[PDB]
Ligand binder design. Structure first.
Ligand SMILES: Nc1nc2c(ncn2[C@@H]2O[C@H](COP(=O)(O)OP(=O)(O)O)[C@@H](O)[C@H]2O)c(=O)[nH]1
Ligand SMILES: [Mg+2]
Length: 169
């Protein structure tokens, strides 16, 4: 069956693990070690296609930089996550965008921008600012809450749709 290799990236504490576990196991985890990097696999149906998602929940630095380059080269699409109450995590998106393009040596890499924690009242990044960034990249932007599940399926399924558009060229 068709397999999609997805990679979830972003600053520590933005909800990469909480998003991934909500997608896979349909519950919200309040505490999950920030240093754990692991992969998950789930069979889903997206637009009538039965497919397997192979999702890498990243944790930042690797023992050797070759491990980072390896997962960036093999990953087919990237979910770039910031938290709407953490401006530094939004600014870090620039770094992930650049680094992924640099390792893949491609200007066209399937990506979706995710503003997570949208259930919280505290917000430092308004929606307009994130829409402006996504527009400059030419990629979709989705606001999510790993806690309420709002937007979670849309974020991952949209990324699959971006991969499919990239492959048909
Ligand atoms: N309120 C709220 N908290 C969240 C959300 N996503 C993650 N968290 C919390 O934010 C903290 C960091 O989340 P985590 O998934 O470990 O972030 P990671 O370092 O990016 O993997 C944890 O305490 C989670 O419970 C969300 O959508 N809403
Ligand atoms: Mg984590």
């Amino acid at each position: 069956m068709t397999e999609y290799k997805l990679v979830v990236v972003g600053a520590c504490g933005v909800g990469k693990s909480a998003l991934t576990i909500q997608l896979i196991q349909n519950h919200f985890v309040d505490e999950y070690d920030p240093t754990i990097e692991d992969s998950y696999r789930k069979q889903v149906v997206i637009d009538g296609e039965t497919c397997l998602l192979d999702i890498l929940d990243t944790a930042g630095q690797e023992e050797y930089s070759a491990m980072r380059d390896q997962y960036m080269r093999t990953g087919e699409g990237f979910l770039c996550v910031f938290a709407i109450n953490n401006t530094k995590s939004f600014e870090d998106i620039h770094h992930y965008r650049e680094q992924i393009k640099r390792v893949k040596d491609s200007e066209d890499v399937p990506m979706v921008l995710v503003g997570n924690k949208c259930d919280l009242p505290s917000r430092t990044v308004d929606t307009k600012q994130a829409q402006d960034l996504a527009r400059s990249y030419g990629i979709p932007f989705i606001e999510t809450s790993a806690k309420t599940r709002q937007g979670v399926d849309d974020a991952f399924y949209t990324l699959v749709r971006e991969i499919r558009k990239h492959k048909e060229k």
